[PDB]
Design a binder for this molecule. Structure first.
Ligand SMILES: NC(=O)c1ccc[n+]([C@@H]2O[C@H](COP(=O)([O-])OP(=O)(O)OC[C@H]3O[C@@H](n4cnc5c(N)ncnc54)[C@H](OP(=O)(O)O)[C@@H]3O)[C@@H](O)[C@H]2O)c1
Ligand SMILES: Nc1nc(=O)c2nc(CNc3ccc(C(=O)N[C@@H](CCC(=O)O)C(=O)O)cc3)cnc2[nH]1
Ligand SMILES: [Mn+2]
Ligand SMILES: [Mn+2]
Ligand SMILES: [Mn+2]
Length: 159
């Protein structure tokens, strides 16, 4: 099973200048809980944005060019990325925009954080078709002293 996990600001913005400009510790904790002990697939730009391997997860990087770091696994196509995960129950695709576009048709589940923040960005999550997806979990949180925007954790499953 392939799942996508992402945090979206207004208008599906996910990034600007290879960074995420907001800071929502509660959402990063949600990301860690939902990805730990699973393989994570990311594009090369997202690997550069994170800047280090994510511990406790098999890190698989898509790039058309040879890898430059043997602490992670490098692959050259979507099918190779999936194969490199082996026989696991759930593969987590962690972006960025180009990678989400390619894996969305293959995904059965979306873990989305909707952040009430207006961000100029240069990268968006794919337009997906709402009729294809059932919301099975949602949890809203107001802003607090640690999280400066309100946010909604949602899990959607392909109908
Ligand atoms: N809010 C969030 O949830 C979230 C999550 C992830 C990322 N982001 C943000 O998203 C932005 C990065 O997204 P992006 O769309 O620019 O880049 P990306 O999807 O992270 O990376 C694209 C790169 O991945 C490689 N790639 C993708 N598909 C491939 C394929 N089928 N075969 C081989 N290589 C492939 C290529 O690398 P080569 O050029 O080396 O061939 C391509 O240039 C950043 O702003 C980051 O902060 C946000
Ligand atoms: N909901 C969501 N939020 C995100 O921030 C997110 N980020 C990415 C890609 N970028 C990043 C950037 C940093 C870390 C990171 O530092 N993660 C630590 C945080 C642990 C914690 O804060 O409790 C990790 O071990 O996962 C992960 C992904 C992909 N999907 C996402 N999905
Ligand atoms: Mn092929
Ligand atoms: Mn197999
Ligand atoms: Mn806000």
């Amino acid at each position: 099973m392939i799942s996508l996990i992402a945090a979206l600001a207004v208008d599906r913005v996910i990034g600007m200048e290879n960074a995420m400009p907001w800071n929502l510790p509660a959402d990063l904790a949600w990301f860690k809980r939902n990805t730990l002990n699973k393989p994570v697939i990311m594009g090369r730009h997202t690997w550069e944005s994170i800047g280090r391997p994510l511990p406790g997860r098999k890190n698989i990087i898509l790039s058309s060019q040879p890898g430059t770091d043997d602490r992670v696994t490098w692959v050259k196509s979507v099918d190779e990325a999936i194969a490199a995960c082996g026989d696991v129950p759930e593969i987590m695709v962690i972006g960025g925009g180009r990678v989400y576009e390619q894996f969305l048709p293959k995904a059965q589940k979306l873990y989305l954080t909707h952040i009430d923040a207006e961000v100029e960005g240069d990268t968006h999550f794919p337009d997906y078709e709402p009729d294809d997806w059932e919301s099975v979990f949602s949890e809203f949180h107001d802003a607090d002293a640690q999280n400066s925007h309100s946010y909604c954790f949602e899990i959607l499953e392909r109908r």
